[model samples]
Target chain A: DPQPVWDAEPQFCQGFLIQGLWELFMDSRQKNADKFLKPLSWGSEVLESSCNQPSTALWQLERFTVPQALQKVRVLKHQELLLVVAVSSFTRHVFTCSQSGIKVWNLVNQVAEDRDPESHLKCSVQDNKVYLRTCLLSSNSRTLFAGGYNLPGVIVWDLAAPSLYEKCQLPCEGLSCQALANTKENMALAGFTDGTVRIWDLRTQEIVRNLKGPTNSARNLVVKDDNIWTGGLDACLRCWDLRMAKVSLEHLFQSQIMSLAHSPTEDWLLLGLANGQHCLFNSRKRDQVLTVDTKDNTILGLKFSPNGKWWASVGMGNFITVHSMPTGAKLFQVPEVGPVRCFDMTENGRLIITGSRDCASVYHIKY
Target chain B: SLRLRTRPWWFPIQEVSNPLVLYMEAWVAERVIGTDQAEISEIEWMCQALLTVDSVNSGNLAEITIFGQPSAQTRMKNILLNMAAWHKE
Candidate 1:
């Protein structure tokens, strides 16, 4: 009988069960294989502290002729402290967020630039400091939105009219907003920590509907074809047909789900679990199709390649692993500088850029 | 009818008291050369015949001994003893 062979060279160190890291691995191969082999890895790190627990280090394996570049960035030491949540890399400019403010790093120039100067206010500061959760670019990759932490609020920045943007605060209290996903029509959905999902009309700065009872800490929210899916520490996966708000569907899990993504073809729901297990469920049948045990640490982040053929995950282990999209076969593994908090791939999926606790690393997939 | 009976088959019989014999057998087995099929067969046949004649049950004793003339057992024992001496160097 043929048995599955366990790999001896699994990337990433396995320890520390709290923090999760996310990275992107680009497959340089045109044809998919039965078993995936990781060719490279990249991401960020944070220091060891009581409030902000230290995370795994990250590194990248370069394939092309370009020299391998490695850098380490640090995260703030505070419990429940929000760091860069969403990253959008458009035309070599990467925009990310921290609790205090929104910072932009010029990938082309290799320098850090602050996009939100003096955007912090006295009321925005909790414990005498401001905090942010999510930041995203508009459909045209021109405007940006910076949402508040533990508060129902959002700030819109117009790239063309950078000074005329305004902060729109929602009518909910004692809620920590975790993520924000936008639609094509300038509509954004804000998932909160109070098990409440709110729809915001960016044009009017009004709450369209307060979709509640899905989760308390809506860790991740995504808008696809006007359908909203939210996951959180509550261990429930809820889907809301935004067009018909009264008819919502919910699925319960045994463990806390940190992140959720629709497969490239939108045929499956990729669930990233707190126990470092990734499960793919058929979207039409709502049945599990495959499950992969990537690590012993919690899976904090997940991203599908642009072609939707491959997927990558990062967590407490400072390692990044990529899987075949339709089959869930692991393809590549690369170590990062520190615990990779979050990552995003370029539109072409040729380059994977990640943000960690200390610094950001970029990887070029030579497929 | 009251004459002394030979060693019964229920009890083990010993013809030699040399601990070196057991040691040599174990050493040869470990080396995989001295205790091959031919040697083991010869030893088994000798022990079985001796036990059958003495009426000794093979399980009665915790140990067993094999005996041969000074030419056979002595030569085999000397070979093992020489190997042990050589190993010390």
Candidate 2:
């Protein structure tokens, strides 16, 4: 049996900071907030400040929002001009369709330092347009993979190189790649819009195995050991073990599953539903441990803190609620500027970066 | 023809002197039916009935009947038989 562990005085605090449309959370427990909260901007794309900061804390910072000159380009929604954004253990980068073409942004260095223009280059094929549906940075933070709408392939970018990128086209055609998981090893699993999952070998750029089921469009994928767990729009969660070609574990939900996050230590899977109800399931035991309900709106994203003690949930209601991991007890709720689309926690479990439709804001919390 | 089995005349005397043996045989003759297997089944039911009566007397019975059959008659018979046999022995 799995039990909840409680700590009255957690190691970190949460503080909210705004940079353009991105709301980020910083660790105020640190000596300098700017070390983690740097100015990150793209051209006229302004980041909105969703929360008000104290005057004492704001007066001590050198700069709040950093500005950059970026050329903007708008592409058709059906054109498949995929926009892939990833955050590394070290820095943050954006690989998207620019006015000149597909470009990558390296958000490192202070505002006064010079940057290389050649670092940005066209990586994808010219005629093939793609829309970014989902992107993920590997758990090891060594590689990044992106999937797009209507494109049957996924673009794998090598972060170790300064400018080079690679693309691997999948064997299945017409079905768009919706979710990608590359956490376990050199294998990358891609979830398609047609409800099929393809396991690809990164070393050879070859398709290893194909997993098909009734629900074709998979919304998210989380890897555990030799098994791959997928949540789909059909309101079902399925688990496929590599040793067995058939799906071994299946869970039906009341509504569509929006996001899934595995616990850092245990086999607990945190599920966010479209109906605003969240549940924690012990994957190994195949039983639901706890459920937290947010009655107003749908839950879009969920993540366990790096320490595996706290969990943060965000959804259509523009509120990020923190709770005790296994017990589902409410700790605190941080209100955001807009509906949160994506969120990432730092390696040390200190900072959080969230992106929404309107702006991005960061929150600093105290223990 | 009745075979005359050789036995000591004290056998009958011993049987009559042991009250428990005499009562046990009487108890078996009253409850047992058919062959040894049938007697064994009857003994099992008798033990189960005694346990049930003991539990009911201790106020542990949940209801007066199971599957809509009254249990009062069965409980009374089990208690009376045990009392009569013990008194005879």
Candidate 3:
């Protein structure tokens, strides 16, 4: 079992900030108050007081109000706000998962939409209910893979057609699905807690193959061309050739991998560790380039910009820092969201959506 | 030597005084509540007032000396208590 999550303080603080931002958005008499409060790079006092610098001043912040119906949770035992399951600009949807249930918000409406039948997705054989652990949006953004803890199979949803959401079920008996990814139009990949990676054919909804992984707990998965990368609590990064199903490269780290991100245009991989250290390495060369201490306790989310010019990392705190790519220079930071569970950037790199306990925040990079 | 600042730059208003009262008074002082508070609904007025003050302070609210209001600090205690213990079913 994963460690219990207590999120009341973070949710209250985040709600407080969201309510504040909504106020600035509503009042018109305060000149440029909204603009001042919306910058994506205003963390330090220097950045907060000034809004004239280039490439750092124009970002606008918008909050999407998840319906009140989806906000309910058990009384203070675990997370109170919706845990951002996944955000995809390709589909223009925000998915929030909770112990109670999963809710979908259409970006066009900015309001929660109801799926037909209104069933709580269950993955485990026992009566554990829904404790969603891993989720993924398909490359085309049509299929959503909702994997749960201790569950044997992943629940697939046809997001393009909501009425027919119970589209497919990919089952891996005895092992719970821990992470998910998509390589091709009809291919889906799931990493299990028992150190196995299963590939599924969505066309037939059948298992394709299973590859041996490096750890018993596969926490993250990344696919680049014909190679599949797996990282887990065992503190090892292994790359396997898809066709051969053999380990091509293996690297060891001092700490467990918390999150992993692959560069969009290169073979460079960024790994966020449990110790709040980020490692930048060239996967092809199998050599580390740099290791940065983020001064955070643990890193939870990491992503590269669409153009690979910069990258962003979110840890267990209120701030997200973006650094210059390859060089890893700290460009600017924003303290806009609270205890981000996950985040995604638009394909154009002009917008970033961060998921917190309370709501999803969309930061428009105006520059 | 004693440093006599009211509070740190990052403390929230909940630690200094009653957040709701300070927020409410700030709304009235800033002309956010119009027409003797008669035109607006009570909840709406209070809601708008809460956001106005917090937003202007940019989330790092401290000290409640801006508004010249009485030191009641009696109202909104129930709401504060609930928010602090906001664990729902």
For lDDT, the strongest prediction is 3
**Candidate 3, residues A36-153: lDDT per residue as tens digits?**
2322221111122212433432345322111111111112112246554555653345566664456554443211212321234434435555466666776656667777765557
> What are the runs in model 1 whose C-alpha is more than 4 Å off?
A1-82, A85-90, A110-128, A150-152, A162-174, A214-217, B1-89
TM-score of chain B of each: 0.31, 0.23, 0.23
For candidate 3, give the docking quality class from DockQ.
Answer: incorrect
C-alpha lDDT of residue A174 in model 1: 64
- Alpha-carbon runs more than 4 Å astray in model 2: A1-85, A91-108, A111-125, A167-172, A362-367, B1-89
- Candidate 3 lands at a TM-score of 0.60
Candidate RMSDs in Å, in order, are 31.7, 29.9, 20.1
How do the candidates rank by TM-score, highest first?
A: 3, 1, 2
lDDT of 2 by residue, A1-367 (tens): 1322322211212222224224333444355752333233321112434344454345656432211111112111212222333434333343333222344443332232222322444324554664456666776544666556645566676654323566455455677777777745788787876678888788887888888876654768888778788877888878888887888877777888888898877778888877788787887888664676555798776777665777777776766777776567776665544556666655654345555542222333333
lDDT of each: 0.55, 0.53, 0.58
Cα deviation of A200, candidate 2, in Å: 0.9
Task: Please give the lDDT score for candidate 1.
Answer: 0.55
